[PDB]
Paper text:
Reaction centre light-harvesting 1 (RC–LH1) complexes are the essential components of bacterial photosynthesis. The membrane-intrinsic LH1 complex absorbs light and the energy migrates to an enclosed RC where a succession of electron and proton transfers conserves the energy as a quinol, which is exported to the cytochrome bc1 complex. In some RC–LH1 variants quinols can diffuse through small pores in a fully circular, 16-subunit LH1 ring, while in others missing LH1 subunits create a gap for quinol export.
We used cryogenic electron microscopy to obtain a 2.5 Å resolution structure of one such RC–LH1, a monomeric complex from Rhodobacter sphaeroides. The structure shows that the RC is partly enclosed by a 14-subunit LH1 ring in which each αβ heterodimer binds two bacteriochlorophylls and, unusually for currently reported complexes, two carotenoids rather than one. Here we used the previously characterised PufX R53L mutation to prevent the dimerisation of RC–LH1, ensuring a good yield of homogenous monomeric complexes for purification and structural analysis. To obtain a homogeneous population of monomers for biochemical and structural analysis we used a mutant of Rba. sphaeroides in which the C-terminal Arg53 residue of PufX was altered to Leu. This single change has no effect on the rate of photosynthetic growth, and the structure shows that Arg53 is in a part of PufX that is not involved in extensive interactions with LH1 or RC subunits, nor are there any interactions of Arg53 with functionally essential cofactors such as carotenoids, BChls or quinones. Our structure shows how PufX prevents full encirclement of the RC and it reveals a hitherto undescribed polypeptide, designated as protein-Y, which binds to the RC-L subunit and to the inside face of the LH1 complex near the RC QB site. Here, protein-Y is inserted between LH1 αβ subunits 13 and 14 and the RC, with its transmembrane helices lying against the inner faces of the LH1α polypeptides, while PufX interrupts the LH1 ring and prevents the incorporation of more LH1 αβ subunits, which would cause LH1 to completely surround the RC. Thus, protein-Y is anchored in place at the N-terminus of LH1 α, then by the hydrophobic α1–α2–protein-Y interface, and finally to the RC-L subunit, forming a stable channel on the RC side of protein-Y for quinones to enter and leave the RC QB site. Protein-Y prevents LH1 subunits 11–14 adjacent to the RC QB site from bending inwards towards the RC and, with PufX preventing complete encirclement of the RC, this pair of polypeptides ensures unhindered quinone diffusion. As PufX crosses the first LH1β polypeptide, then LH1 α, there is a PufX-αβ interface that consists of several close hydrophobic contacts, and the C-terminal part of PufX wraps round RC-L on the periplasmic side, held in place by a network of hydrogen bonds. Each of LH1 subunits 1–13 binds two spheroidene molecules, but the 14th LH1 subunit has no carotenoid.
Residue numbers in the entry:
A (entry chain AC), H (entry chain AB), K (entry chain AD), L (entry chain AE), M (entry chain AF): 1 to 55
B (entry chain BC): 7 to 48
C (entry chain M): 1 to 307
D (entry chain H): 1 to 246
E (entry chain X): 15 to 69
F (entry chain L): 1 to 281
G (entry chain AA): 1 to 46
I (entry chain BA), J (entry chain BB), N (entry chain BE): 6 to 48
């Protein structure tokens, strides 16, 4: 582990930080959309059922 | 070394980067803990 | 607006160009034709010369006999009447043998025997023209890229007229010679095979067809946009990159993050066009031999909703 | 063979479409690597090799044997500009414009840029000069359209720069390549045919004001133009679209 | 001085709004042309069936 | 990172809007004011398609389908789940396409090249707007536009076509097909010819453009030339798209019947309509 | 907050103000169109 | 945490502030549209029912 | 630090103008929102 | 050290203003979430 | 086996590490998607049935 | 057998190693997909039936 | 037979071995797919029937 | 030499490493096949 800092001698941080930012946002978006597509985990539908907001 | 960073610069940059990773992942752990207590997925 | 270089402002004319000699047998070249000033606004004015060696005689005379055989069938369908001939021209059709004749050669002349004769003349004409494209390149010492590209078109044509009929086991599967009838055959083929839009190779073939219009729109517009730098002298730009080729590359790089070279754009060009008929012939050859209902096949392959 | 699958839904049509995707991936890899024969390796803006070179490796070198004893071109091979570039950084970070340090028209930068091509003429298939003044081209004459010879040449300031004194023609392709314009001082210049608009009583140049025509680069011999000189002239004229004064 | 500066800031923002308006209004005029033409043609009599399963 | 020749071209200016504010590159990509616009509209449209898949209840990208409003909405706005998302995505698409074209214009200006490329792309945009905007508003409902889905837009093509019988009989469609087929032919020949000259038989010198002329003259008795073939490839492509848009904007607006019946005008010209025999007598 | 004025040392105010005019106009149009497409708020059908 | 200011040694604020402005407006617009497409949280639709404004 | 060529004092002055008109614009918007809410409450 | 030509002191200065904007923006966002949560609780 | 380090004299580590990173992510995504496509291993459906969260 | 090392004088090891890695991965993926497509060898469905995990 | 080695003076071994490799792999795949398509030779279905692994 | 420019010693060295990788990979594959065969014979 101690030598993992040498990644920055191979990859330029300006590119890596952009790639990481794009990656983490799209990953986070995709997981939230997966849960919203899942009836047991769509928090907006769960809360509608909890608070009787549908009819 | 392709990037032109010295070994000392690579060490410094990595240390700050890792503090970013730990902070982000600690917030994520708290988020997972909250959602797990609210609604377990196992 | 400024000058767009779509039509020439001034035409110039000099002594006619007889062409490069290389290993060409010069006795088989015609003389030069007339110069069309009408064509000279858009491209070259010079017509000819044309080369007419042994395969060209074979191809043209066989092609003439194909065209003449269909023509005399249309005059017969017109009842020899010149007014009816012109009225019904697009409606006449030389049709393949009916299904009960299979692949046999016993079908009567009116019942598809003439279609077989015409198809034989077509077969010889096209294949001898392929050898003509190959040998014209050989005699000039050129690469055979044109003949190999043409083989992709011949592949679809062979599938339509020959290979798929043989695999299906009757000539009745082949395309009729006739303007509206070959359109009607095209429509009927899709209806019989359960909507050809769900044939993935027809989808690919469309993608390459649209891609060919996309790519030639891009490439044609690009070369005209750099023509102010001599960009259309592409071979010299390949041998000695000028600012024309650099500006062309950077426009696309800055636009879409990657670019071609002056040689390599023509490798995109040839393959984009070739893939139309290469994928096309596969898609047709699979139709009825392997898949008889492409929509149902699409339902079972995750591309159409289930019933 | 209809309905015959090796496993699951894997039809002979399935085998075909999966085979095509593998072919297309290989073909696209081939096409992109063939298109890397110019301009690579990638550089930092200081001109040193960039740390990132992208996912496709460079192709093996190929050699073109050039006609007429002009030698060989091998590509990819050592790229160099082989001329001064009068641009300075506007910013320490990458990705920003580089500003002209002098007159960009004279310096040949930006849209005024030119490439250090061969300082020899382009040759036709027989080895003669491809582009000649039409007064030197034995049988050539204007065959259609307004003959531009003798028309005044108007700059985009709407003032007269000179008059047309000859056409230069592409001999094998039989087309007009340049207009030769005699300037006020009696020297001539070449204007690219694509950058002029011929009109019934004038030739109009949208790219240059009349004061810029003297700065058009001259040809070193009056009967031929080199590929280097073509790039310099065409670069300068197009540069006027950005840099000519209002 | 400051009234001149205030007017300059307002003018620059009005340039952007004016172009965004002009393009938007021109778009609506083009839409209105095709609407007027479609009202003059026999379309109302010969209305096509819905091409989509959504109807 | 630059191409080895790129630096001399990366100068200020040529922008239509924003001055120096956006006059910079993100890697290879030039940004500009319209690059900002293009990215925003593209990202928003893409994410709204993914959200429409959440509402649809599918993650199979081949089954994802954003349908336009039902005909009952006419040209009004619909509920987002019931076609209002198609409306927003269509605005995003139009914003992205127009921003992309305008970004190409300022790239042309910076490089000093002609405007042929953004002009050519505007034909593709106008064909798109024919199918989603001009024809639907003539016909009075958004529901005549096509749905955004890989296979479902082909259902729209099929259903629209067979509304008029075999759509091959549309005369403008026949012309458009002929330009499309001719363009692909010309592209194949042009690619092959340049490559055959640059890549001769083994150990031969590069062929000249004079050899390119000679090969085509020998083959067909004519050569259009190096300038003429690029003019041709552009105009064939653009004519194909122009006649495509024309064939659709007349369909369902001035023509309503089976397109095969249109050709009877020729057959029933009075100087031969009644002559017996043939196919039509 | 007191240092937010330094934005005008990063971005050229002339260009920002033009772009902000575009942004605010287009944003407003978007919101009005959302309300016209809303039957409870379409003030032209009331 | 204390060294996160060094990010401005890696990215120029002009490029960052543009990228951030696009990101934040994109994210906000997307979340509002997600809620407008959701019956339980579409405020325009909730208000219409609350005050009986439909029909 | 400066990419625009404004001095610090110029930027301070220009920001004071921009903020004053931003507050006025938000004030007019608040009035429009209040009028619409009184007319037709969206909560 | 840096790619941007900012000094260390300038990078600190710029970060202090940036973080003020971030905390201001997030503070109003928290208020907006609180108002909406009171009006219509999720979870 | 001890000689496997010589691969970094054959192949440039920049391309290998990018290729590996992409490869591993797409492999991981593939395996998670396969399990989500499997009713006996979709953990969201399993927890939905376990905790009686459906209907 | 012994002389087979001379293949590396014919083929550049770089080209071979990339081609072989692609080949082996696509081969392995195909064989696993065959077995998943095969009801008697889909290990996820076998374990589902073994442990009574469906309905 | 003893002179068959002279083929390598006519045919370039790089081209031959590549063409041979592609040839033999595609031929092998084709034959295995034919046998899997043939119910009497699908070894997976044969073993499934032998060991009663379905229904 | 051959077409690649590897010397005979370089070719012997590279082959020795390559073959050890091949044996390692195939040894693992043999154990995998044995485990699956004992679990579920395909003959
Ligand atoms: C016959 C009717 C049928 C349909 C047939 C349709 C065929 C269409 C072919 C169109 C080719 C256009 C491109 C081209 O350059 O053409 C000119 C070229 C060179 O001319 P030259 O005069 O001989 O040489 C000049 C010299 O200076 C060198 O020039 P150059 O450098 O430009 O040439 C190299 C080019 C040429 O390469 C090819 O043409 C290969 C063609 C392969 C076609 C395969 C299509 C069908 C299979 C897919 C179906 C898929 C769906 C089923 O180099 C390249 O273009 C390289 C392309 C690389 C593609 C790599 C793909 C790898 C995929 C596998 C990855 C595996 C990873 C583990 O000619 C040739 O080299 C010969 C071409 C022979 C064509 C195939 C003939 C029929 C083969 C089948 C029957 C006989 C064998 C059983
Ligand atoms: C033009 C007349 C008809 C039409 C009739 C057909 C028919 C018929 C076919 C297609 C096919 C295709 N059509 Mg369609 N299609 C139309 C309008 C569109 C529009 C549009 C914005 O107007 C788009 C983007 C597409 C997109 C596509 C692709 C899914 C596919 C291949 C196209 C291609 O290679 O083109 C040339 C361009 C290139 C080669 C460059 C690469 C283009 C890439 C592949 C486009 C990807 C689009 C992506 C999946 C859509 C989502 C975008 C993302 C959210 C960012 N269609 C209209 C309604 N289209 C074929 C297919 O296979 O469908 C399944 C097919 O059979
Ligand atoms: C109702 C109709 C069906 C349908 C049924 C078919 C059928 C059936 C076929 C196609 C095929 C094609 N379809 Mg489809 N297709 C439909 C809808 C579409 C739509 C659309 C927008 O809806 C589009 C864009 C397309 C597009 C296309 C092309 C990609 C493809 C033909 C390529 C080509 O160049 O062929 C034209 C080129 C040739 C046939 C090659 C000719 C070469 C020969 C050698 C030339 C000889 C010339 C001769 C000697 C005379 C010369 C005389 C001169 C004077 C010298 N289809 C619907 C679903 N389609 C074909 C295909 O490949 O399918 C996969 C095909 O067979
Ligand atoms: C890669 C796919 C694309 C493709 C490519 C392609 N086609 C090609 C080539 C290539 C690369 C060639 O090299 C070849 C060619 O030569 O092009 C110039 C060809 C070609 N593509 C052709 C056509 C064609 N290509 C098409 C399409 C495509 N071509 C695809 C889009 C289509 C359609 C329907 O889409 C057509 C119709 C030809 C122009 C040519 C092949 C010529 C050939 O084989 O001709 C045989 C027939 C004859 C020589 C003569 C026929 C009879 C004529 C009536 C002449 C009669 C002469 C007589 C002296 C006069 C008689 C008068 C009396 C009857 C009164
Ligand atoms: C007019 C002649 C032909 C033409 C020309 C042409 N196209 C062009 C150009 C030119 C000259 C460009 O300069 C430009 C370009 O940059 O090319 C690389 C472009 C281009 N042609 C493209 C595609 C394309 N062109 C097509 C057609 C044609 N383009 C014509 C045949 C087709 C089809 C179907 O026929 C396609 C798919 C792109 C590669 C590119 C334009 C890229 C662009 O607009 O970028 C900004 C937008 C995005 C990156 C994405 C936007 C995403 C949306 C917000 C959401 C998706 C909405 C969409 C309606 C969904 C549809 C779903 C489908 C399943 C139906
Ligand atoms: C997928 O489904 C959904 C969308 C529902 C769920 C998922 C949501 C996700 C994944 C959301 C992700 C959100 C993220 C990544 C949010 C991040 C927000 C951040 C980082 C916001 C930062 C804001 C910062 C601001 C507003 C800063 C402003 C700064 C200033 C105004 C001052 C700048 C400095 C100046 C002007 C002077 C500097 C100059 C000198 C000379 C000192
Ligand atoms: C389909 O499958 C699903 C999606 C359902 C499930 C599967 C999901 C999968 C496969 C998920 C995979 C996730 C992975 C691989 C996640 C990886 C996450 C990582 C590695 C995150 C790292 C984050 C790092 C951060 C936020 C670091 C930030 C650093 C900083 C803020 C400081 C940067 C350094 C500075 C400023 C110092 C500069 C120094 C000098 C001297 C100038
Ligand atoms: C789909 O989601 C929807 C659209 C439904 C909901 C979401 C909406 C979103 C995401 C909205 C986002 C809105 C944002 C980010 C708005 C930002 C607005 C800002 C920052 C506006 C600032 C405007 C500033 C102006 C107009 C300042 C002008 C200043 C001057 C012209 C100086 C001149 C002096 C004046 C005007 C004073 C004149 C008066 C006297 C007496 C002299
Ligand atoms: C549809 O039909 C089915 C699929 C059902 C049945 C048919 C299946 C078929 C046709 C299967 C065919 C299988 C074949 C042909 C398999 C071949 C496998 C081979 C040849 C595998 C080889 C593996 C080799 C490996 C993993 C080697 C690794 C090497 C290393 C780790 C070391 C690399 C060398 C170094 C670092 C030395 C560098 C030296 C210097 C001096 C720098
Ligand atoms: C539709 O009709 C169907 C298809 C049903 C029925 C009709 C079928 C027809 C028409 C069939 C036609 C069959 C024909 C024409 C078959 C011809 C077969 C021939 C001619 C086969 C020849 C084979 C020759 C071989 C295998 C020779 C091999 C030679 C070598 C291995 C050695 C080469 C020489 C070397 C290495 C020496 C080199 C020397 C120096 C000094 C370098
Ligand atoms: C003015 O009157 C005269 C008579 C002077 C001239 C008039 C001529 C006219 C009006 C000609 C009309 C021509 C037309 C309308 C031609 C239309 C052609 C079309 C649209 C063809 C479309 C597709 C054709 C295909 C796909 C054909 C493929 C054929 C093959 C691949 C040939 C395969 C070979 C076979 C079946 C022969 C097998 C038999 C033997 C003995 C080997
Ligand atoms: C290039 C982009 C192309 C796509 C562009 C889409 C733009 C859409 C703008 C919609 C503008 C508002 O449009 C408005 O919609 C509403 C709601 O349907 C219509 O309202 C209509 O339906 C509702 C019920 O659904 C009835 O109560 C109402 O009486 C009726 O008129 C209005 O008559 C129309 O004025
Ligand atoms: Fe070209």
């Amino acid at each position: 582990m101690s030598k993992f800092y040498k990644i920055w001698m191979i990859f330029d941080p300006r590119r890596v930080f952009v790639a990481q930012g794009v990656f983490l946002f799209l990953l986070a978006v995709m997981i939230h959309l997966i849960l919203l597509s899942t009836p047991s985990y769509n928090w907006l539908e769960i809360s509608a059922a909890k608070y009787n907001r549908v009819a | 070394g392709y990037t032109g960073l010295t070994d000392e610069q690579a060490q410094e940059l990595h240390s700050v980067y890792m503090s970013g990773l730990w902070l982000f992942s600690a917030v994520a752990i708290v988020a997972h803990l909250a959602v797990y207590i609210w609604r377990p997925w196992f | 607006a400024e000058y767009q270089n779509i039509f020439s402002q001034v035409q110039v004319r000099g002594p006619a160009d007889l062409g490069m000699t290389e290993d060409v047998n010069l006795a088989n070249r015609s003389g030069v034709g007339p110069f069309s000033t009408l064509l000279g606004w858009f491209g070259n004015a010079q017509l000819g010369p044309i080369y007419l060696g042994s395969l060209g005689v074979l191809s043209l005379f066989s092609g003439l006999m194909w065209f003449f055989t269909i023509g005399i069938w249309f005059w017969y369908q017109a009842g020899w009447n010149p007014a009816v001939f012109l009225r019904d021209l697009f409606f006449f059709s030389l049709e393949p043998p009916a299904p009960e004749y299979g692949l046999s050669f016993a079908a009567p002349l009116k019942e598809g025997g003439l279609w077989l004769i015409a198809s034989f003349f077509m077969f010889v004409a096209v294949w001898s023209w392929w050898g003509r494209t190959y040998l014209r390149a050989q005699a000039l010492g050129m690469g055979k890229h044109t003949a190999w590209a043409f083989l992709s078109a011949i592949w679809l044509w062979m599938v339509l007229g020959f290979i798929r009929p043989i695999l299906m086991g009757s000539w009745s599967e082949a395309v009729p010679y006739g303007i509206f009838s070959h359109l009607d055959w095209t429509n009927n083929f899709s209806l019989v095979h359960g909507n050809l839009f769900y044939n993935p190779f027809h989808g690919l073939s469309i993608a390459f067809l649209y891609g060919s219009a996309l790519l030639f729109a891009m490439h044609g517009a690009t070369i005209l946009a750099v023509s102010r730098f001599g960009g259309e002298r592409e071979l010299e730009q390949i041998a000695d990159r000028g600012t024309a080729a650099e500006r062309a590359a950077l426009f696309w790089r800055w636009t879409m993050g990657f670019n071609a070279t002056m040689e390599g754009i023509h490798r995109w060009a040839i393959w984009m066009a070739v893939l139309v008929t290469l994928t096309g012939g596969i898609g047709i050859l699979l139709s009825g031999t392997v898949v008889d209902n492409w929509y149902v096949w699409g339902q079972n392959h995750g591309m159409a909703p289930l019933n | 063979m209809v309905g015959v699958t090796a496993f699951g839904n894997f039809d002979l049509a399935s085998l075909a479409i999966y085979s095509f995707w593998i072919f297309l991936a290989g073909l696209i890899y081939y096409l992109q690597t063939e298109n890397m024969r110019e301009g690579y390796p990638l550089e930092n803006e200081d001109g040193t090799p960039a740390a990132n070179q992208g996912p496709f490796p460079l192709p093996k070198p190929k050699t073109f044997i050039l006609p007429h004893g002009r030698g060989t071109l091998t590509v990819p091979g050592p790229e160099s500009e082989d001329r001064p570039i009068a641009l300075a950084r506007t910013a320490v970070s990458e990705g920003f414009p580089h500003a002209p340090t002098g007159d960009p028209m004279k310096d040949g930068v930006g849209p005024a840029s030119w490439v250090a091509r061969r300082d020899l003429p382009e040759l036709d298939g027989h080895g003669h000069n491809k582009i000649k003044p039409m007064k030197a081209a034995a049988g050539f004459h204007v065959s259609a359209g307004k003959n531009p010879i003798g028309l005044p040449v108007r700059g985009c300031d709407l003032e007269i720069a000179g008059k047309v004194v000859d056409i230069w023609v592409d001999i094998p392709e039989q087309m007009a390549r340049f207009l030769e314009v005699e300037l006020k001082d009696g020297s001539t210049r070449l204007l690219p045919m694509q950058m002029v608009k011929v009109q019934s009583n004038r030739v109009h140049v949208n790219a240059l004001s009349s004061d810029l025509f003297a700065g058009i680069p001259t040809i070193k011999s009056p009967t031929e133009v080199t590929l280097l000189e073509e790039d310099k002239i065409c670069g300068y004229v197009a540069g006027g679209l950005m840099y000519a004064a209002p | 001085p400051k009234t001149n500066l205030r007017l300059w800031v307002a003018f620059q923002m009005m340039k952007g709004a004016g172009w965004a308006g002009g393009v938007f209004f021109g778009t609506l005029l083009l839409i209105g042309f095709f609407r007027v033409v479609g009202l003059m043609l026999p379309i109302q009599e010969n209305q096509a069936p819905a091409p989509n399963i959504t109807g | 990172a630059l191409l080895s020749f790129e630096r001399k071209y990366r100068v200020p200016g040529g922008t239509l809007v924003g001055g120096n504010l956006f006059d910079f590159w993100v890697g290879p990509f030039y940004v500009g004011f319209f690059g900002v616009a293009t990215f925003f509209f593209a990202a928003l449209g893409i994410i709204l398609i993914a959200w429409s898949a959440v509402l649809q209840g599918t993650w199979n990208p081949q089954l994802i389908s954003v349908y336009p409003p039902a005909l009952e909405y006419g040209l009004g706005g619909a509920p987002l789940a019931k076609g209002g998302l198609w409306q927003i995505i269509t605005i995003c698409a139009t914003g992205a396409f127009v921003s992309w074209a305008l970004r190409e214009v300022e790239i042309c200006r910076k490089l000093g090249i002609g405007y042929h490329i953004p002009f050519a792309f505007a034909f593709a945009i106008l064909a798109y707007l024919t199918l989603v905007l001009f024809r639907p508003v003539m016909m009075g409902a958004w529901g005549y536009a096509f749905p955004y889905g890989i296979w479902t837009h082909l259902d729209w093509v099929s259903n629209t076509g067979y509304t008029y019988g075999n759509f091959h009989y549309n005369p403008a469609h026949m012309i458009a097909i002929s330009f499309f087929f001719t363009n692909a032919l010309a592209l194949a020949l042009h690619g092959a010819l340049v490559l055959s000259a640059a890549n001769p038989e083994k150990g031969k010198e590069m062929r000249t453009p004079d050899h390119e002329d000679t090969f085509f003259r020998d083959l067909v008795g004519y050569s259009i030339g190096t300038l003429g073939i690029h003019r041709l490839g552009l105009l064939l492509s653009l004519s194909a798209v122009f006649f495509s848009a024309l064939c659709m904007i007349i369909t369902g607006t001035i023509w309503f019947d089976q397109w095969v019946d249109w050709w009877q005008w020729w057959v029933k010209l009075p100087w031969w309509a009644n002559i017996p025999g043939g196919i039509n007598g």
